[PDB]
Symmetry: C2
Subunit: 130 residues, 2 copies
């Protein structure tokens, strides 16, 4: 079985600035899963950031953790089987290894525990200096 | 929550060589979960490698994937809350990112589904040169 999630983006950023992450998934996984983002701060467990789920037609449902509401935008593109996280107004507190996630059981975007995740992309370092 | 699993070790070795990896777990996870290793080969989804019974003190079961049987061995140091993956007679085909994992819903060493894993350590690159 081929790797299901392939992620892109990351790097060093100044406080206040923006950075975009993205992740592709296989056709089968993209269509069968709620896609999400998690982050692992230094010395901490990975915690939920945001999720997005397909709805009938062109529609999507999005859900954000309290830490990131307003400042981040999640989106998806069916034609490219890709999910995106645009992060804005970044703070030193946002420094972490960021992971994309696929959850086959969940149907509608909601808070996601890491134990419910079926597939992970490879983690990527995002560093925000003051 | 503090990070549960911290991996150590990795690098480039030659075919026929050996290498031991390690991973520390919180006291709580060491006593409660089956611990194991997975590996993610280039362009492939991560696969089960080895597992060890919960609370591996003076005695434990160990279990292995067919592709690593006899060459690979898993053990533990209870006093250091640490599990080890010993890899003998390495082949170019063992080249992969190696992950340690814990599943709190398992007690006896056995095949681990990646979907059922509660906690992950950060991947470590092992490259075996032809």
């Amino acid at each position: 079985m081929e790797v299901q999630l392939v992620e892109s983006g990351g790097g060093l950023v100044q406080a206040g600035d923006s950075l975009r992450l993205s992740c592709t998934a296989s056709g089968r996984t993209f269509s069968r899963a709620v896609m999400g983002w998690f982050r692992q701060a230094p010395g901490k467990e990975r915690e939920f950031v945001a999720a997005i789920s397909a709805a009938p037609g062109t529609a999507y449902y999005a859900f954000y953790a309290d830490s990131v509401r307003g400042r981040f935008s999640i989106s998806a593109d069916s034609a490219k089987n890709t999910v995106y996280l645009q992060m804005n107004s970044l703070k030193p507190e946002d420094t972490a290894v960021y992971y994309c996630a696929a959850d086959l059981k969940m149907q509608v975007a909601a808070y996601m525990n890491q134990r419910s995740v079926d597939y992970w992309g490879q983690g990527t370092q995002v560093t925000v200096s003051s």
